[PDB]
Amino acid sequence: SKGTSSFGKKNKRNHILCVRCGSMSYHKQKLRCSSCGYPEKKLRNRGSPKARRRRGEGTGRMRHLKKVRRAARNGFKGNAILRALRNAN
């Protein structure tokens, strides 16, 4: 009753895909992601010290940041076509 019989009724799925963080944590009734806190503007304060190691900055692709490290290393010379045009004048 309390255990094995009651697990047959667990066919609802409350936490669905979050559109911000992509974890299966967006609640349907609550309309809030339990992981990242969407749709609050700021990110939810992560519930563990390891949660930054899993989900924080640097754990993803860092598509813009890897470009701006490379430009900062070279001195922010920017677009190579426009670099020669500013140098001629």
Binding site: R13, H15, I16, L17, M24
Partner: protein, 51 residues
């Protein structure tokens, strides 16, 4: 379950195309230490969390 949103089916298709063995020409590459796909997923043993 035959009624699904667009997001559910795209995630289900992405899980399906992923679920395949290593292509057999990869076993002849040098430095290929992989013999079978350890991330193979069977539908009855391993569940997907696509809700």
């Amino acid at each position: 379950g035959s009624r699904k949103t667009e997001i559910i089916k795209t995630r289900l298709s992405r899980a399906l195309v992923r679920n395949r063995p290593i292509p057999v020409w990869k076993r002849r590459m040098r430095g290929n230490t992989q013999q079978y796909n350890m991330k193979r997923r069977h539908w009855r043993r391993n569940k997907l969390k696509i809700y």
